[PDB]
Each structure stands twice: as structure tokens, then as C-alpha cells.
Amino acid sequence: QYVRIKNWGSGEILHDTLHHKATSDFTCKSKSCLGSIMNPKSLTRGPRDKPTPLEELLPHAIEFINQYYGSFKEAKIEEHLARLEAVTKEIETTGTYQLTLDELIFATKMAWRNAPRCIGRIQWSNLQVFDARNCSTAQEMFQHICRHILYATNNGNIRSAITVFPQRSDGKHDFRLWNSQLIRYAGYQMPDGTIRGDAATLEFTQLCIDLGWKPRYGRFDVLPLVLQADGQDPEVFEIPPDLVLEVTMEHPKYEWFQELGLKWYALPAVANMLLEVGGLEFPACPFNGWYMGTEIGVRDFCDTQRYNILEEVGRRMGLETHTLASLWKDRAVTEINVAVLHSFQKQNVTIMDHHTASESFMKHMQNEYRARGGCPADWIWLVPPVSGSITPVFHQEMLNYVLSPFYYYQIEPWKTHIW
Amino acid sequence: QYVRIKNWGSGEILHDTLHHKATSDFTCKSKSCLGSIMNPKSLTRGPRDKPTPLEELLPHAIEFINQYYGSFKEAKIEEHLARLEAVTKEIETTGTYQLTLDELIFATKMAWRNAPRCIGRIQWSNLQVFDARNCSTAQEMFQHICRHILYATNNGNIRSAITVFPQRSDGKHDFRLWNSQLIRYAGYQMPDGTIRGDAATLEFTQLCIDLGWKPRYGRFDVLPLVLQADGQDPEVFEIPPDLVLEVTMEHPKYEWFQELGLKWYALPAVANMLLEVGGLEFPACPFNGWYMGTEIGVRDFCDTQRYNILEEVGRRMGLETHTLASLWKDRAVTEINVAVLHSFQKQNVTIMDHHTASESFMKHMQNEYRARGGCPADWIWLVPPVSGSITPVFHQEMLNYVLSPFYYYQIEPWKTHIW
Ligand code: HEM
Ligand code: HEM
Ligand SMILES: C[C@H](O)[C@H](O)[C@H]1CNc2nc(N)[nH]c(=O)c2N1
Ligand SMILES: C[C@H](O)[C@H](O)[C@H]1CNc2nc(N)[nH]c(=O)c2N1
Ligand SMILES: CC(=N)NCc1cccc(CN)c1
Ligand SMILES: CC(=N)NCc1cccc(CN)c1
Ligand SMILES: [Zn+2]
């Protein structure tokens, strides 16, 4: 039966029944709890060597088709049963099946809808889908991605979108983007042991250099796209600079902020996740939404392991940078968050502060419970990296479970790749 | 075997083997994750009607005795085996057993050490234990508690301490403190629907009033102690005002802060938890440590469901209180945190900011892994209510499991009490 869930802020109670559809086992054991693990196996969908067994696929495929046709207001039994039949025949005769464009569209929005770590799921229905299932080469990939970047960026007025490339067949011809994000900065380890740029991309930057890319050695050097089509080796493509919109950071009071020389790309596009639907797997389906301040202000700029700009901004504010209990870190990070939001608005690039994001997610969560009695939600990821208890999601209890469709992680392609 | 755990901040890896000793099942299922549940059953140890079965007790008792004697540098096999024998005989002849003072001391520090939601466990070894196992009446309880409060408060220089009252026998004569905390403010619902004081204590305040306590109707009215000795009904005792040390809040710049009329008790003492050790249960064992800024500054003052002073301090700062994206909440809460720390230091009352607390916990966690290969830790509770990613614990992966000794929650005494 349902699991009782409470919001200590409003005292409200919800009954989650949706979790009953969860699939395999999650992270945390039966007696241990592995909830703060970023990459648990229950969240990763690795490579394959052979096709998915008919016995497994068919059952899932039927399930999905039933889910799709079930989503309609006033059904279409005939079309429904018809579809189930066609899919069965297709698997018997081909060994797999093709989703109708409409079902793919439905599949991508549902998987988004079922992303427990996404705070912007209130937009799950507003998503542009580019069907690249016909793609054959890396060159065509690069072309599609470019269309995507251009469509999504929309001159600052960001639009959510996803590009679906060929589904995995035998797992021996997988289409993959070796990049973590469509657009990202490179990390160079200078001779003197000093890291320059985005430390998070040190290994990947090396990979690109290894694949022949010319390293410019700058704090903000956009990395090349490394595409892998039909199981083939990867090819490196520079991304047209005109296509990459960036926001230069500047604070509305501390005019010395510009003197830090900060900027960040406007498009947050995930490139390496796998889309699973009806037994089908899409190892290459780059998607994007718009930024939430804290991602850049808090994590990207202040993470000790990223650009780590917190002490500098601290000193530039003349704070007791050496008296930890002075709470200078609290003062600094907040101003850096104001610079990010302010600088994005100034330049007309869509962005949303964390307080507002949190509010909408609660609204969404309520709709999800009224709509289907549940909302897979990972509290650890949904609560903003700053102002935790000051946002309402912090006070909301939640259940995290893997449904289907879903967006899984994958093993880094350079590890599992036969050159 | 061990579970690999990583700290994304340092990239460091740890191997947790300690979880192997975990007992029953935790919160999160096999496929679902109930990690953000405050009161899961796996964390509560309710009432009993009969004694604990010999078959269960003996096994646990032996386990504990083995753990105790095992903790020594260069053992005492003779004393050890001797002790195991005496305890066995004692259970056979009495139906339970008594812990030596030393074992109780060891038991209380271990249970603290095994508290997954405690960020100050680096102090687990520094804890004063007051043995009240001989207590017979409520009056004697009240006396002990008073000694505790006086000892712990130590004129501002707070000292960690715990008072252990009689262990549960048949569960029909349980010693219980009906209070959530030794010292806490009352919550009154004014006629016009307006809450006054601490909203979190509305129900309990009513209970005290029902039991005859005279309601003064103020924002900061210290609640009476409601003691229950040997299964008897509860009796209400006013706490000697001289014994309750309080800090009046004031900001080191915004002199208008004093005009808010804020203060808070200096002693954070948990009163309603149950201590479990060697099959034994102690339903009444009030303990205390010292405050961590955010508890008061962030949660108590800013929780919408507590004193909710965030918009007031916002306006008093002349912030865009109506433009959520202005991040005024971020500015306000921080100043309220500075007032708390500043006001505590000013008056010489021990307190620790969250950044410093977080740092020490990491140090402790490292010691715990080197010492015993593990540290039961609940990430959701250990990460401060503000400046999440700015503190190192946010970036540390951790496993949460219930070991023994342990401090369990209990069912509210007024629900399970035969008057
Ligand atoms: C339109 C507004 C959107 C906003 C503001 C938003 C915001 C967020 C944030 C803050 C995160 C956390 C990222 C991190 O901390 O590294 C996240 C994660 C995620 N979002 Fe969204 N999102 C949006 C759109 C999308 C879209 C369109 C999709 C997919 C179709 C999506 C799928 C996900 C997934 C799967 C994650 C998990 C990423 C991971 O596990 O690494 N999001 N989102
Ligand atoms: C000496 C310094 C100490 C500090 C700074 C400290 C700090 C904390 C904090 C911040 C919490 C979270 C409370 C909340 O958010 O409601 C907590 C919880 C807890 N602490 Fe500590 N603590 C200390 C000492 C103690 C002592 C001495 C014990 C026991 C002997 C203890 C046992 C626990 C337990 C069991 C919890 C869980 C409370 C619950 O689940 O409601 N702590 N502590
Ligand atoms: C160890 C811990 O799981 C890890 O640091 C998590 C915490 N919460 C997070 N939340 C979001 N949105 N993004 C992250 O990368 C993380 N990191
Ligand atoms: C719903 C959620 O579990 C709840 O709000 C938790 C989150 N983390 C917490 N952390 C601490 N220290 N104290 C709390 O009361 C909470 N509340
Ligand atoms: C769409 C959005 N706002 N953010 C999702 C996201 C962007 C960049 C990196 C990561 C890390 N997985 C997630
Ligand atoms: C000892 C310490 N610093 N804090 C523990 C604590 C104090 C008051 C209330 C609660 C809520 N369970 C916990
Ligand atoms: Zn869990």
C-alpha cells in the first residue's frame, strides 16, 4: 500500500503509491543506506555485447506501449491493441522495434518526469525533440548537435530540447558523445603542478589533446565535441564559436568583480546519459534545459575542485578570510550568486534562482501526487547547495526510485572502447 | 567485503567494513529509498509490555561484554571471561543484568559515537556520566536533572554530559521525560489564530497546561519538566530560573537587532531518546552537548514553522523582501547567524559555527575509518542547513547504518500511557 510522506514545513501529508512500479534494486541495501552515492550501479546502464534477449524486450515493450496509450484522455483501444500487435511482429521479425515519433516524444518527457535528481521537472511537458535516429556518421552527429545548440540557445532565450540518435542494437555499434556536457571548458595541468581552467575536465581535456586537439591553455577554453558514431572510433569537432553564447560575470555594486575575468556558458546540456524506454536503450541523447543560479555561482565557481574562486572574492570584499567563524564564506558565495543572476538578466539569458526553482518543484510535486500518486525524488540532489532549510524542499520528505522511461548514467566510453 | 566511498572534494577513497555489524533493516527498502524520512521505524524503539526474552538478551549481552573488553589496549581475558559468566548467571537468576559503571560510561560514549545524525562526534570521548540508575521518584529525577543542567551549563562554559536513569524492566515501570529537550520555550495559540512562542511546542505546551501548569503566554517562556518515574503518572516541575542560562541576541553592526527582542537558551539537551546497550534499554537518559550556530540562527529563528523571523530581519535590512530572486533570504539568514555567534561569544557561552563543525567531523570521520573502518553517517542531517556545498561534508559520500550501542527515538509518552 501507500507510503506516508510529510512536509515538516506545512505539516501536510502525501501517500506515495507510484513507487510500486519501481524496477530493480536501488542503492541503499536492506540494512545499510547508500543514498549519498553519486554513481551507484542502480543508476548506471553500461555497455552490451549482444542484443537484448527477446524474452526481456517484448515484456518491457508491451509495458511501454500500454503506458503510452494509457496516457491519453479518452483512449484508443483499437489503435492500442493494433500497436501492441505491430510491435510484437516487429520484434519477432527484426529482433527489436522502432518507436513512433510520438512515442519517442512521450518517452523523453516521461524520463525527464522520472528524473529524481531534477529540480525543474515542472517543465517536463515543454521539451523540443529532434529525431536524429537516422544519423549514420559523426559528421551528421556534429551537424545535429549544432542544430540543437542553436535551437536551444535561442539568442539567450533558452529552450529545453533533446536530440535522439540511433538506439543501441547489438551494443557493438553504439552512438556516443564522449563529452560530459555539449558545451564545457577545458582543464589544463600547468607544468608547475598548477591546474588552469576547469579541473573537472583534466582527464577529458587530455583525451582531446591525445586525439589531436590543439590546447590553448586558458581558464575558459570551450572543449571540442568528441563524437562516436555506429561503434566507430571517435572524431573530434570544434564547436562553431558563434554557436556558443557566454555570459561575462559582473556584480551590480562591487565593480571590481569584472576584474576577476569570469564568464560561463549559457547552455547546460547533458551529453553522456542513456535513455531507456520500452526495453530500448539510447546511449546518445543529448538534452538541455536552462541554468539555476547555484550551479554556476555556487558549484562551478566555488567548488574547491572547480574554479574555487571563494577566497579571492572574499579578500576582494575585505573579509576576515582567516577567521572561519566570521562566516565570510557565507557572505562571499552569496555575492557570487548575485553576480551570476544579475549578469544573466543583464544580458537577457534565461536563468532561475534557487528559491524560485525550489518553489516550483514543490508545486510540481503536488501536481505529480494528485496526478499519479508519487514523484521519484532524490532529496540529496534536489536541495540547493546553499540556503538549504531556507528553501521548502529541505522540509519535504521524499522517496527516490527508478521508474521507466529513465535517464541512466553510462560507463566512460574511453574505458569500454575497442580502438 | 568493504564498500568503496569517495570524497569528491579531495578525490580520496575509503573502505567501509564497519557496516557489516549493522543490525535489523534500515529505512530505505530494497528498491525504494526512504532516506529523507525523519522518523522511520528503523530508528524508533517503542514501548514494551513484558520483559525482554532471555533468548534475545543473553546473546546481545554477551556481544556487548565482548565489545567492552575488546576496546582495551592489551586485554584482560580473565576479567573478561569472568564478566561474561557473572552476567549470564545474573540473567538466569534475575532475568536481566546490571552494567558496571564503567561499561555504562563506555556504552554512552559509543552510542554517541554511533549517532549517524551527530556532527560533533569528534567529542564522543569527552562526556560526563551521571549515574541515576537508583532513582525512585519524580522528585529525585527533577533533582538529578537540575544537577545535570547546572553541571552542563557551567556558567557558559558548556560541558557535555548525560544522566542515566533506571533501565526498562517489564516496560510497565518506565522512567520517561515527556519533554523533547530539557530546556525549551512554550508555544501558545492565541485566540485570534496567532501562534506565539515556539510553534513546535504547541501540543506539549497544552499538555503541561492540562497537567495544571500556569501559561504565561510569552514568546520565550521556559517549559516545565514533566517527569514520569517507575511507570507512574507524570508530575510537573518548574525549572529553577537561576539554572537556565540564556543569550540575548544582538548584531555587531545593525544595532536595531536588539529591538527584535530575541534570545535563546544556551543548553541543547535531548530529553526523549532511548539508550540501547547489551540488550538493555534506557528510556530516560537526557544528554547534552553545545550548540552549533545554525541550529538557532537558521532552524530555530528562521524555520517558517518555528519563530520565522526571516522577513522581519529582511525588511529591517531594507531588502527587496518581495523580489524572491534578489536573494534577500540569503543575506538575512547570514546576518542572523552572525548575531547568534557574536551574541554567544560576547556573553562567553560555548558555541561553534557550522564551517568549523563540518571540518572537525571530517577529521573525526577519518579517525573513525582508520580506527575501525567506518562511521555510521546520515548525510541529510550532517550537512548544515545553509552553505551546503561550501562545507566539506557535502562532498563526502557516506553510509548510514544502525549499530549498537545506539540512541533510538521513542513513541510520545502521552500516546502510550495508561493514566
Ligand atoms: C528547463 C529547466 C531545467 C532546470 C532549471 C534544471 C535544473 C537541474 C539541476 C539544478 C540539476 C542538478 C545538476 C547538478 O547539480 O549537477 C539537474 C539535474 C538533472 N536534470 Fe534538470 N533541469 C532543467 C531541465 C532538464 C531537462 C530538459 C532534462 C531532460 C530532458 C533534465 C534532466 C535532468 C537529469 C537527468 C538530471 C540528473 C543529472 C545527473 O544526474 O547528473 N533537466 N537539473
Ligand atoms: C559537544 C558538541 C555537540 C555538538 C556541537 C552537536 C551537534 C549536533 C547537531 C547540529 C545535531 C542536529 C540537531 C538537529 O538538527 O535537530 C545533533 C544531533 C544529535 N546529536 Fe549531537 N552534538 C554534540 C553533542 C552531542 C552529545 C554529547 C550527544 C550524546 C551523548 C549527541 C547526540 C546526538 C544525537 C543522537 C543526535 C540526533 C538527534 C535526533 O536525531 O533528533 N550530540 N548534534
Ligand atoms: C557526496 C554527495 O552525494 C554529493 O556531493 C552530492 C550531494 N548533492 C548534490 N546535489 C546536486 N544537485 N548535485 C551534486 O553534484 C550533488 N553532489
Ligand atoms: C525532510 C527532511 O528529512 C528533514 O527536513 C531533515 C533534513 N535534514 C535535517 N538535518 C538536521 N540536522 N536536522 C533536521 O531536523 C533535518 N530535517
Ligand atoms: C539542465 C540543467 N539546468 N542542468 C543539468 C546539468 C547541467 C550541466 C552539468 C550537469 C551534471 N550532471 C547537469
Ligand atoms: C547537542 C546539540 N548540539 N544538539 C542536539 C539537539 C538539541 C536540541 C534539539 C534537537 C532535536 N533532536 C537536537
Ligand atoms: Zn537510503
Side-chain angles (χ1 to χ4, degrees), chain A residues 87-267:
Chain A
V87 183
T88 310
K89 290 199 166 61
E90 197 169 322
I91 300 173
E92 279 177 351
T93 60
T94 72
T96 191
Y97 71 121
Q98 297 297 164
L99 292 177
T100 80
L101 178 61
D102 260 55
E103 309 175 331
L104 178 62
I105 292 175
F106 173 85
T108 67
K109 298 184 179 187
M110 285 302 298
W112 178 7
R113 190 179 180 178
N114 304 328
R117 302 179 162 177
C118 188
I119 198 177
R121 284 182 279 168
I122 191 168
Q123 286 281 316
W124 74 277
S125 107
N126 298 182
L127 173 69
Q128 174 53 35
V129 194
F130 294 131
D131 184 347
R133 287 183 287 174
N134 46 59
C135 203
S136 321
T137 66
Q139 180 69 207
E140 285 175 291
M141 269 175 99
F142 175 63
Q143 274 158 54
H144 279 106
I145 288 180
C146 284
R147 184 210 199 310
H148 185 148
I149 302 171
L150 185 67
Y151 170 89
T153 301
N154 192 28
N155 202 212
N157 184 16
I158 315 297
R159 288 182 297 207
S160 301
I162 179 171
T163 287
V164 188
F165 285 109
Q167 64 197 56
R168 175 178 286 164
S169 54
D170 63 336
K172 309 276 301 172
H173 311 301
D174 291 321
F175 278 77
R176 297 283 293 296
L177 290 74
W178 291 30
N179 311 58
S180 353
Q181 296 169 55
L182 250 36
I183 293 169
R184 217 217 252 246
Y185 298 124
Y188 311 99
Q189 172 151 64
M190 304 305 238
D192 44 287
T194 296
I195 304 74
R196 190 165 182 176
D198 199 327
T201 72
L202 285 168
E203 178 175 47
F204 186 69
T205 293
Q206 189 53 60
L207 183 73
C208 296
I209 294 190
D210 290 320
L211 298 184
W213 180 72
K214 296 296 176 180
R216 296 110 62 174
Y217 297 96
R219 277 163 76 203
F220 307 96
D221 296 353
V222 181
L223 286 168
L225 239 32
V226 176
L227 313 193
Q228 172 195 306
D230 185 67
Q232 255 62 72
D233 284 335
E235 305 174 339
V236 191
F237 307 68
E238 202 72 55
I239 299 178
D242 297 293
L243 294 175
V244 186
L245 173 56
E246 300 173 292
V247 179
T248 50
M249 297 307 155
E250 68 181 50
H251 195 295
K253 300 295 156 47
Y254 307 2
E255 304 306 344
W256 49 255
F257 208 84
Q258 294 122 52
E259 306 182 55
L260 299 167
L262 296 169
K263 64 176 175 175
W264 200 262
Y265 39 95
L267 193 72

